[PDB]
Amino acid sequence: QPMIYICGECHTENEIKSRDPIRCRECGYRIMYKKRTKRLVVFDAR
Amino acid sequence: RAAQFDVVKHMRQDQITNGMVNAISTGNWSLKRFKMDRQGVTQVLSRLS
Amino acid sequence: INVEIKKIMKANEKVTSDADPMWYLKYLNIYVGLPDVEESFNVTRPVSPHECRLRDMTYSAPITVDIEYTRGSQRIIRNALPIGRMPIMLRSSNCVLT
Amino acid sequence: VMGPMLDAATRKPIWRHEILDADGICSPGEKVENKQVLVNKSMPTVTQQPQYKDVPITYKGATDSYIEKVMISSNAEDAFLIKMLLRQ
Amino acid sequence: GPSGIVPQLQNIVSTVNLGCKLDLKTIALRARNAEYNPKRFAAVIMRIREPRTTALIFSSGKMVCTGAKSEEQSRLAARKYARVVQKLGFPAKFLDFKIQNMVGSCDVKFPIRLEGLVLTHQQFSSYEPELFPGLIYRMIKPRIVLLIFVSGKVVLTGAKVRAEIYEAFENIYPILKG
Amino acid sequence: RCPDCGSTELVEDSHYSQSQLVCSDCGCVVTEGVLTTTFSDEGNLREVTYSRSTGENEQVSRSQQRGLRRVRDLCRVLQLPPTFEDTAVAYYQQAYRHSGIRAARLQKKEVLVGCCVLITCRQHNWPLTMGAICTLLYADLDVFSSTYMQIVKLLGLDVPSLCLAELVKTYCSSFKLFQASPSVPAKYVEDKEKMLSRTMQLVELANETWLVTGRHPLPVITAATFLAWQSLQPADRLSCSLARFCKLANVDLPYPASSRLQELLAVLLRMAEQLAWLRVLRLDKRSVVKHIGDLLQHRQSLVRSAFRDLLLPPCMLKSPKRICPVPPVSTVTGDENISDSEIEQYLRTPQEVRDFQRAQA
Numbered sequence A: 001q002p003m004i005y006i007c008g009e010c011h012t013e014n015e016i017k018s019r020d021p022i023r024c025r026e027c028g029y030r031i032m033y034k035k036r037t038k039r040l041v042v043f044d045a046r
Numbered sequence B: 001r002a003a004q005f006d007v008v009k010h011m012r013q014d015q016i017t018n019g020m021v022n023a024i025s026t027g028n029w030s031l032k033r034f035k036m037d038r039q040g041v042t043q044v045l046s047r048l049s
Numbered sequence C: 001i002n003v004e005i006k007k008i009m010k011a012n013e014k015v016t017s018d019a020d021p022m023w024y025l026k027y028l029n030i031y032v033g034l035p036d037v038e039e040s041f042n043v044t045r046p047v048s049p050h051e052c053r054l055r056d057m058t059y060s061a062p063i064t065v066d067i068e069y070t071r072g073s074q075r076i077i078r079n080a081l082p083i084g085r086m087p088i089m090l091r092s093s094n095c096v097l098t
Numbered sequence D: 001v002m003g004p005m006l007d008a009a010t011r012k013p014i015w016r017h018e019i020l021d022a023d024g025i026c027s028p029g030e031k032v033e034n035k036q037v038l039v040n041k042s043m044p045t046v047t048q049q050p051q052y053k054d055v056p057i058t059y060k061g062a063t064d065s066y067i068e069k070v071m072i073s074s075n076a077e078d079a080f081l082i083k084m085l086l087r088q
Numbered sequence E: 001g002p003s004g005i006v007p008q009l010q011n012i013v014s015t016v017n018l019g020c021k022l023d024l025k026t027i028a029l030r031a032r033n034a035e036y037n038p039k040r041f042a043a044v045i046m047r048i049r050e051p052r053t054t055a056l057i058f059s060s061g062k063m064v065c066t067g068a069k070s071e072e073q074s075r076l077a078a079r080k081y082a083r084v085v086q087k088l089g090f091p092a093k094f095l096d097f098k099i100q101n102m103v104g105s106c107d108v109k110f111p112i113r114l115e116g117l118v119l120t121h122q123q124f125s126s127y128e129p130e131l132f133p134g135l136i137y138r139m140i141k142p143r144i145v146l147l148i149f150v151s152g153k154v155v156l157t158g159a160k161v162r163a164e165i166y167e168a169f170e171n172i173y174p175i176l177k178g
Numbered sequence F: 001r002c003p004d005c006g007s008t009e010l011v012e013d014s015h016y017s018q019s020q021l022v023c024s025d026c027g028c029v030v031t032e033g034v035l036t037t038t039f040s041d042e043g044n045l046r047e048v049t050y051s052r053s054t055g056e057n058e059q060v061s062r063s064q065q066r067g068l069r070r071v072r073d074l075c076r077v078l079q080l081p082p083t084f085e086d087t088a089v090a091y092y093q094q095a096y097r098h099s100g101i102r103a104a105r106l107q108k109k110e111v112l113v114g115c116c117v118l119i120t121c122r123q124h125n126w127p128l129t130m131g132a133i134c135t136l137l138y139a140d141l142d143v144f145s146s147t148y149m150q151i152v153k154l155l156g157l158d159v160p161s162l163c164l165a166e167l168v169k170t171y172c173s174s175f176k177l178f179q180a181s182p183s184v185p186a187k188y189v190e191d192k193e194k195m196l197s198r199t200m201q202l203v204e205l206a207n208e209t210w211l212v213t214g215r216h217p218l219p220v221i222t223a224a225t226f227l228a229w230q231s232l233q234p235a236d237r238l239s240c241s242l243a244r245f246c247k248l249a250n251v252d253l254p255y256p257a258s259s260r261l262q263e264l265l266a267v268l269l270r271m272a273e274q275l276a277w278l279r280v281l282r283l284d285k286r287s288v289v290k291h292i293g294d295l296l297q298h299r300q301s302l303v304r305s306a307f308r309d310l311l312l313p314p315c316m317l318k319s320p321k322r323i324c325p326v327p328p329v330s331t332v333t334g335d336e337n338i339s340d341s342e343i344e345q346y347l348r349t350p351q352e353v354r355d356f357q358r359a360q361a
Ligand SMILES: [Zn+2]
Pocket: A007, A008, A009, A010, A011, A012, A024, A025, A026, A027, A028, A029
């Protein structure tokens, strides 16, 4: 249900859903990247 | 106070750090010692290529 | 960073008051340290330059000194008093990348 | 930052909030047109409960762009910091 | 309802006006239990064994008494002091007797987690073990202040009549229990 | 409302560049074009505080400006964020409104600044001990406590509690055991993370077993860290005492820490009586320290079973047969005077009168 973020170094899936400070659950790293969207997108081969 | 004080209670830490980083970032180097100012002494590194 | 700070300290090593003499403060040695980051609860860990780019932080290292001063007795010495933080140039002696 | 509000009729987000993820921030990989909202930021009126006025981060651009990656991080001052990267 | 433990008063405070001018030096000189040290404070202290109370004289014509176990007993102590002052030669009277404060204490015989009491009632209950182990609790109906401790014993203070202390105990007992 | 239609369906919209207000109902324009600042004057932008722009900050007395300067310096030497500084100065400026606060001696104001920073930091949930700030002040702890109580009851402001886990999390880093410094043998060095986990579970056990209520937490945390450091290497550290451990750590040990450690060891023995192997091994105060691991592995069931045997101050647990005995009813005051010889007993004779005259001549 909650949103997932990827830690910038160990790539372990984390969840926040809160006003908590951004910190990796596992390591000390403090950078998080959002996951790729689930929708499809249509491109032209040109 | 009649009883002796100590200076370690007044080691103002912000003064040096601020003094430098605003000088580097702004590129203005005012110095009362020489009654002169130097402008435009730093620039943002260009990363076109 | 290696020598000229030593000379600047040498030129200003002592200070003494006219009011209430026999009290004085005297530096002994100054060190430049390695770059690090202030953690939210009064600790530090080694920091790489790229993290300083992404987080808008500044890449700097702590300047710290040992000091001698009097309070009643003249025997109070500290060894690692910080005075500030010095920005670090990349690939210099101290930078992690070198 | 609040989630995207949805039309009662279509049960889907209104056009301006098309690309927002549930957590109120844009989603990597999507395509963004002109005059759409990337971060649904609102701030209180204190300048009895505090009213919040909206100040969204809208995308202004002559041409489309694709979102490449979105970064979340915080500073020592507990400030949230969001950075986004857009591709043409 | 009550658990069979009735709060017991341990102190009363009362005052009365003597209605005449008095000399502190004369009282200190002529009375046995009188204590007077003008270098410290300009008042005389009085002590009697029945009632077990302590009281003070002031030259402006005022008297205070405290230490009794009941308000009637405090009045008895005050009237005994007034009689002593009268027979010492001062034209004193027992005018405008007033009960000022009475303290009580009680127990519930079960532990009171002060953490829970604070995190449910922070608005008027203050909890701070470091300077004071007990929890400090103020109340509006009636205007009383309490001290609640780990063992479940409670100290009650600020009342004018035992009914207030009783009803305060009844009010807090369901809070103490849960 | 649309001047042409009366309907209230106005939608804010913009064409390629023009910003405008359009009646969506009929396609009508009712307002367009905006006047804005530029970037050229952006670089010239100054700022003035509303206090400066409304006639304040000139009436600040020499003592008030000295006091707020003290607030600034005391908060900054502790490396707090600027938010803490600004909240502290705001609180003190509000507090100075009270007549009984402004008219006062200097040391009382100093301890008021101390409690001001204490409340501001508590508001942001930062754990800071009263002892350290008291030592930073030039005032004794009693006056500081008295003024802290006075201000919190004068203002009625919220006082967040000193949460235990964060105080442990701050305190733990003061242990210089985790560095292989020449002063401390490398035998005593240990990993920090598992150190914190063991200390955290011991402190949680102490909290749920009633040891922290009404009592100072620092000695309990000291006992927890010590039993942890022992239990993590029984082979050698079992022979070290609290004096030796505090000497190695260069940390002073509270005197009640020994009593808290004894009480917590008693709790540990009460827990050990349930486990099948420990209760047969017939353990003792010293040997129990090498099973804290499996005692805490299965904490919940064992402690719940032991609670069905609670913990309370030992001073009262001595099996008090009589609890708060009812005193005899002695509310009778007689009719008018139950005795009169007492007054003669409480007055001096002329001899003793003259003796008192000469006693202090
Ligand atoms: Zn990580």
